[PDB]
Structures are given as structure tokens and as C-alpha cells.
Nucleic acid binder design. Structure first.
Ligand SMILES: [Mg+2]
Length: 100
RNA sequence: GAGCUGUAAGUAAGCUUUGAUCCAGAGAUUUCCGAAUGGGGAAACCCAGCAUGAGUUAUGUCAUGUUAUCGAUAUGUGAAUACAUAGCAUAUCAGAAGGCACACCCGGAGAACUGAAACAUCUUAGUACCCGGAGGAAGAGAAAGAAAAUUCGAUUCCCUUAGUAGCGGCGAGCGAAACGGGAAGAGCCCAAACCAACAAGCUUGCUUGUUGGGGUUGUAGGACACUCUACGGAGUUACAAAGGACGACAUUAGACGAAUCAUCUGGAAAGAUGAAUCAAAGAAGGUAAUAAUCCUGUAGUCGAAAAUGUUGUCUCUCUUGAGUGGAUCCUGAGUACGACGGAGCACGUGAAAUUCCGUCGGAAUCUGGGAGGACCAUCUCCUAAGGCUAAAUACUCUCUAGUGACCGAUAGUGAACAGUACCGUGAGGGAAAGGUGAAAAGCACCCCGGAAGGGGAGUGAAAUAGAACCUGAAACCGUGUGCUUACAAGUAGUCAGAGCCCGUUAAUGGGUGAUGGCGUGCCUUUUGUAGAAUGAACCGGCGAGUUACGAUUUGAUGCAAGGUU
RNA sequence: GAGGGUAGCGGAGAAAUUCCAAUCGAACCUGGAGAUAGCUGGUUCUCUCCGAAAUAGCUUUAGGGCUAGCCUCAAGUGAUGA
RNA sequence: GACAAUGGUAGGAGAGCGUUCUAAGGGCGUUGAAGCAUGAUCGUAAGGACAUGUGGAGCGCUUAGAAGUGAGAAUGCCGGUGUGAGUAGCGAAAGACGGGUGAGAAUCCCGUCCACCGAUUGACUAAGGUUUCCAGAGGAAGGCUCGUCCGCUCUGGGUUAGUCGGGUCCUAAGCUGAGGCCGACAGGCGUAGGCGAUGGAUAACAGGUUGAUAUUCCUGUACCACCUAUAAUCGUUUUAAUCG
RNA sequence: GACUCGGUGAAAUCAUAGUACCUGUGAAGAUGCAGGUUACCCGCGACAGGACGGAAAGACCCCGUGGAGCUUUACUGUAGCC
């Protein structure tokens, strides 16, 4: 489960192996947007004259994995209660720095 | 615990880590109509009285309360009539009224088509429909019983008895019960004798009334007579009733939750190939193809501020129990029964006992009364004419969790997008209509054209996936061609056969057809159909011996004087 | 002309079986209800073996039914068949 | 191996083909499943393969089990598409020409001439309908042809009351009806009283003005109810003026 | 109106049709059968002899132990009345 500012890795699709970072979330369809991944080309009409534009489209969230902060490998995520508050762990190391 | 302002996409303007949107519990607000209730009315509107209040020099206006009819409880008053009464008035209370899944239950009233190869007794059937009353169940229920043993011991339901006994234009048909095996199990309160009080007549004797206590039954019990005895038991599901404490579970939101990498093909891998790992988890669904190890989850474990629902332990609240005498007193009256007319009991009034309704008659009192299928005698069993009662049983418009050798868009609900289009004055009847792609990346720009449409370019793995969007059959409509046809008489094929054109699942091949022989569609129904007898415009989809319970016979299999529940 | 009344086992009729929502020897709608139909129509893949009847008798029977005759399958007996 | 048999309707008997689903086993599939199309293939029949094109994610085989298990006919039910056929019809009637607009004009707009109704094809008010009304834009469908037009599509607008017609007034027929009478239930009737116009009562006229309203808006001049002030007349409130 | 040209454009019906006549034959009145006799291929305007032409599961007739309305000294009841 990934937040808005993390640094992830793509594990499925055309762009498998790229890193990028998250910029949008869309939780109702569970599809994130990652920079430089899944780029599309739109035909926009004049609204100024338009033309072909390139932006990123959303990818399904289960095609993305976080990176172990220490060893820098993909990992799943668990939870832990500290100070009576929930944090994220890397299933291969300790705490996971996710402030922004 | 990071996004959010419905389906619902946009833009704008905003909200949110000082915790939003979202989920559960509890509150607040809740226009008008509708039983509709201040009066009226063509529902969703019109018109008022009274009391407060705002406003106005004052009217008009506005705001908030209250005002139906029956019923209950008080008070006052009182007609024909003197007292009285019927009424009348005022004030408190809020008892009824309407609706439903009203499926199942209990009552009132109650058909016909049909079967009997016609039809009337009978049957369909106490069924459909209509009306009333209710509950989570209702009804029944504690022997005036069943029986004929050496008896049993409230009611209801299941299996058997058994398609037996019986009933029946003895026709068609209708059709039990006791015994036996089980589920469940529970018993109680009055009326009366009597006693103690209070009260009115009365003459203080009696009568009657009110409260309380007592007391409840059959091999007779209780009153009375007498002799032996006391707070432990009981309880809100009947048996009398209220309410507190502290607990324990279960709902109604949730939380944590093990383990995988690489290459090949490809738009994309979960597939193939290779090497690993978890398992109290290899249920399931998603993810760009088919995943135990990517996501949501699963096995397992944890969790409640608040409100409900159960359930314990205290509290609480009630309350003596035996024996002998047995026939002095009490023990349910217009009742039980009878006659006449009907109905219900499996039973058609009959050998009809047994049980109810209408109209008339009308008992007995323990040496009593009732039943044991007319009646009599003896035996046996019971004790009517007052009431209450859980469980085992029936149903599903709903809610929660699941299941299927159930359907897959003409199917499955009428309805996957609707009791809506539409039809009818009305009651009422009642459709058709699912699928782009993995992702909108939904075709910038150029050209012809008023536009609609199109050709390029571009997106995409694919655009003969372009929104009339998965696949895209047949009828039907066209364009181009290889062979053939303007002297010919036809159910349109078949057998023989030159010429011309091609070249296959490669075998004594394929297309066309000058000319010759033979040849009156199909189905149904008939003695007999080319029939001028019936049916079909054509193509597609849909459309007719099934299932339950009995009987009989055959095959198979197990055991055998036994077999089987 | 407007506002009203009479309703199907019924109403209305200067009378015709006449009218009661383009329908009347008994309106329309929903239910009993899949009424009943000894009558007509229909009833869906293939091959192999055998193969009738259109007649007695009774029948509120005559284009229906029942028993017998004639077909088929299985087992049995054994000259009973032509 | 020898010998024999083998037409067939009602109808009896036997052996099989194919469809959907389930169980167990064993397989195939993005190097392309089902479906669809074509072929000169195999089996005694129902039927089974293989190859190529299209298609884009599921499906066979073996043994056994279970059935909504097979269509050419029912004046069958639903959908689609033909034939008749470029055929019948295009719903009472008088138009002609010039100019305009437009991609496009017999059919739209403007003008002149001609024609038809005129106890009416003219002008008012009711029922009934319910936005059809007006302006700007449009031309896919509707309009029995056409269309630049429209009662059609889109966007935005439009209905003004003390006196007009209803209510805050009255009653007819009829309908309801507190108490009441009757009735298996449901309910039927009816007294006082209510409701109910098609009738009775009841105060406003002339002119101006919009694309769309007018006795309603504006100007002028009126009338009718009700309330408060300013007042002559008011004189126990019997009476008196007053009201009743 | 019909007929020719421009616009628009249905319907009943329909087993498939390359659909002649005569004398016969035949379920006894033939475009489809036999033996002959006629006839080059394709339209348009007209006529009504045949296709037992279309339309409506004959209303006449008979049958069904089918319905309904009406009558009476048919059978059985019954509202009422005495
Ligand atoms: Mg064609």
C-alpha cells in the first residue's frame, strides 16, 4: 500500500524496471500515476491551437512495489504500533521513512 | 487516516492532518395530503371561531397555540311533571378509528364448470371468492376419557396400523381409530359449605349486601370433630406481583495476518523453461493471457465510547404442613335430557350410539348422576353444566451468513437497461431494449463538400475494434467474370455424352453442358390424392409422453427358511 | 344546453329481442381455470429383425369402448402342425 | 467353411450416432481456444477428422453418471427480409408574372393583377385541449411532393383586476347526514343541519400603449364597502333621536 | 380519373416454377399424365374464359349422450300466497 510521495518500482507492463515516483492516487479505482510511466499522446483541439500532447496515464496499483530503504529491493509492507500509532515496515528491514 | 463536493463526466468556486469525505450508535429538524379529526372539498386546496403576540392613528395582514365523533372520569343543571328522569353544559384523560406479505391460524357466510361416460341423491368441496378477529404462532389441553390387560393416566405433532374396519343411486367415489414406536413434557385457579368483620332494612332475631379468610375432589374430596406440627421453600412463561445491584455472553463499525526471482514468446505473463519459498492459510475475486508467494483476502488471533438482546449471582417479594372420623352440611338449573326441524362427526337419520344450532317442553342430589354404538339387567371406567396454561407443530413480504451435476439476454422475474412507452371513460391490460478498448489514448492537422458523409495523416497489438462500436450465420440486394442460351412445350432432376475452361485432402480429378433416354413436389387424411381435398411467402430462433407416490412384470445384485427396517 | 337519477338473477322501452361506451336471446374486467372437448390439427436423430386389421359378441351403441380373432417378445412342453 | 434368409403402413423387439452438465484420469491453447467460411477427405447410417482464411480466450479425449437431449409442416409465437411494383394512391377548389433571399425555389418573403366566401370560409363568448403563444437560430426525423418554411428541433421570453367570471352571499334537483330506524357480516334508509348553478343578489367607463397582456398596465374622470380623525343634530336611555 | 414525364411510394396474395391447345386418361370437369397439333427472345395499353381465382376452419344439411333463449296439463324443486 503506497502513498502519494513514495519512490516505487514497476513490476509489470511495458515499463517494468523503471522507478519514478507517485504523483496521483485515485483510490476508488486503485490506480496510481507515476512520473515517466505509461505515457500517452492526445489529440487536443484548439480551445490556442492544440496538437499532440504527452502526459502519463494511471497504472493499476498492484503493478507497483515499494523499495527497501536499506538494501534497495522491492518488498511488501507490514504494520506496527509505536506510541499507540501505526507505522510501515519493509518486511526485510525496519521503519520506512514516508513523510513526503 | 488522505483525499473530498450523489449516479456524473466538466468548469468554476471551495473544504481538509487544528483530521475532511466515509462507516456504526444515539439525538435534533421533519413543508403539504392522507384514518385526517376546526368547517367544506373535484387528495396534495379553499374558508373560519377563540386565546395570546408583532405591527398599524386604527382597520386590513401576519405568527404561535387550541377547536371532530363516539368512549371514560368529575361537576353543575334540568322538559312534558311536584320530586325525579331523558336530556343539556363545563373540565380533565387520551380508549377506539386506518394499514398490512394481513402467507400461516381461528371464526361468519358459501358457488359453478367438473366426475358419475346423460342426471336429480352423491362428487368437485366446506374448495374459490367475500366479511370479521388476532399472534409470532394460533387452535387444543388436565378425563362425566381410552379400554376389556395383570390395564393406561392432559393436549398437540411424526411413523405404522391401512387403502384395513366401515360409509355409498352398496354406483362414481369417500375413508378412520385404539394398541405399538418416537419428538416434547407441567400443571393450576375459582363458585359453594364455613368463619370473621362492616352496612341497610329490620327488630336487633332474621334477611340481604360488601371485604377478607377457607376451599377445591371419585376406591369420593372439602367443611366440621379431634390429634401432630413451622420459615424453609416459591416466584414474575400459567400457578400473585416491582424493581434494584454486580457480572457473562451475543449482535450492531473494525485491526493484525506467512511466503518469488530470472529468461523466452508477446502489446502486455500469472503461460513455457530453470532454480526457490510458505502452509492451522492450495476458499474466492482482481491484476494488460491461466498467480498459494503482486493486490483485496483466506486459516488464525485481537477489538466497543454507545444502544439493544439474552443469561447468571445477590437483592427483592410471597407462603406452615400432616393424620383419623365419612356421609351431619357443601359440591356449577331453565342446566342435563326429551320431541320436531337441521348440521357436524370417515359415516347419505340408519341398529345410529356420540357432539352442536332454532322452537317448544323439562330432572335427580352420593342409596346421586354419566359412558361402554337401539333397549334392559349385571359388571368396568369416570364425576358434566366455571376459567387459565410453556414445549414438541405451520408460514416467509423480510434481515444476516451461505449453498446448487439451477438460467445465461426469445432464457432467468413482466422487469440485468418497468408496473414505465403505450392501450382503455373505468375496473384493468401491458412491452421492446446488455457487450469499443488493457487504458479514452474517442481520430491534432490537410483535402472535396452548405452540411451529412468520405480520402489521407495520426492513436492503438488490432479502426473491415470509430460509438448504429466483441464474434457477425441465413433469407434478401448488388458489381465483375469462366462455360452456356433468341425453332423452343418444361415437378427443372437423373442416367448416357461431345466440345470449351481449370488443376485437387492426387484419385480409375474439378467447373460448364450441344444432344438422347426416363421422370405428375412434400405433409396430413383416406377404399383410393399429381390432385381442382388440408397446410406452409422465405430464412432464423423458440415450440409436444415429464415428475412424485402406489401397483404389476422383466433384468441385475445381496442374503436365504428366512429377508428387511 | 348545463347539473343530476335508475346497473346485468338488473335497468330503460309510443314494443323493434330495442338500447345500456363502434359489441347485447342477456355488457365489460379479474378470479375458480391448465373448466370440459368420445372432435380437428400437431408430435423433432439413424440402421437391423419380424409384421397386422378394417371381423364376432354386448353397449343411450353405431366415425367411441370392452372381451375374443389376427401381430410381436420371452420361457416351456414335445409330434400334438401342413 | 457349406447352406439359407434379408419389400413393407398401425405396431412389437434390438443395436447405435450426436447435444448440455458432473466425477475421475489424461491432454491441448496468444507459436492462437470456441464460433463462423471454403475444400476434390473418412465411416454401412445417424456422423467424425484434416488443411487454409476470419476470430481473440477458452476447449476436446477415455470410462461412468444425469437430462429443459435432436423440428419442415400445428390458418403455431417472435424477429428480419421479399413478391405484387416503380404499380394503386398523394383527402372536395384558380391562379399568373415581376423582384428578393439562398448551395439549392412551381412550393419561402414582398408587389401588382386575377379569382372564391360573405345568415359567412367574417367578428365575439362557452366547453375541451394544455404552452401549441412571441423573438432569434435550424433543417436529421415529422409535413402524403419540395422547402431557405412551420402548430417540428434549439435557446431565451410572455398571462398584472376592490368594480370582468368564481370564492369570503342565497337556495333547486340531487348527494350527504349528529342523535335515530332496520339489517348474517359487509351495510341500507332517514330527522335537524350541511353541500350543490344551469337560476336570484351584487360597485368602471373613455382614450393611449407592446414582438407577445389589457374594462387588469398608463392618463383622465368615477363608484362601492370598511377604519380612524374633524365636527352642528344626539340628552334617565323606559323613553327619546338611536338601534332592535 | 385513366395514359406520357419529374417527385414520393403501399396492399390483399405467395410449395418451387423455363407455367400452350385438342382428343383421351385419371379421386369419374388437367399448364404439369399419353398421343398428336401448334409455337423465335423481351415489353406496353386493354378485356375478363380458366387457374374448381382472393376473402371468411359453410350460416343450408347431418352428427356430438356439445351449449344457450323460449313454452307447457315433461321430471324435480322453489320465491311467495292460503
Ligand atoms: Mg441481387
Amino acid at each position: 500500500h503506497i502513498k502519494k510521495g513514495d519512490n516505487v518500482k514497476v513490476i509489470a507492463g511495458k515499463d517494468k524496471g523503471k522507478e519514478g515516483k507517485v504523483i496521483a492516487t485515485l483510490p476508488k479505482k486503485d490506480r496510481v500515476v507515476v512520473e515517466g510511466v505509461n505515457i500517452m499522446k492526445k489529440h487536443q483541439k484548439p480551445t490556442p491551437e492544440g496538437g499532440i500532447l504527452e502526459t502519463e496515464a494511471a497504472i493499476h496499483v498492484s503493478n507497483v512495489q515499494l523499495l527497501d530503504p536499506k538494501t534497495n529491493e522491492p518488498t511488501r509492507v507490514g504494520y506496527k504500533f509505536v506510541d499507540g500509532k501505526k507505522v510501515r515496515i519493509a518486511k526485510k528491514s525496519g521503519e520506512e521513512i514516508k513523510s513526503n
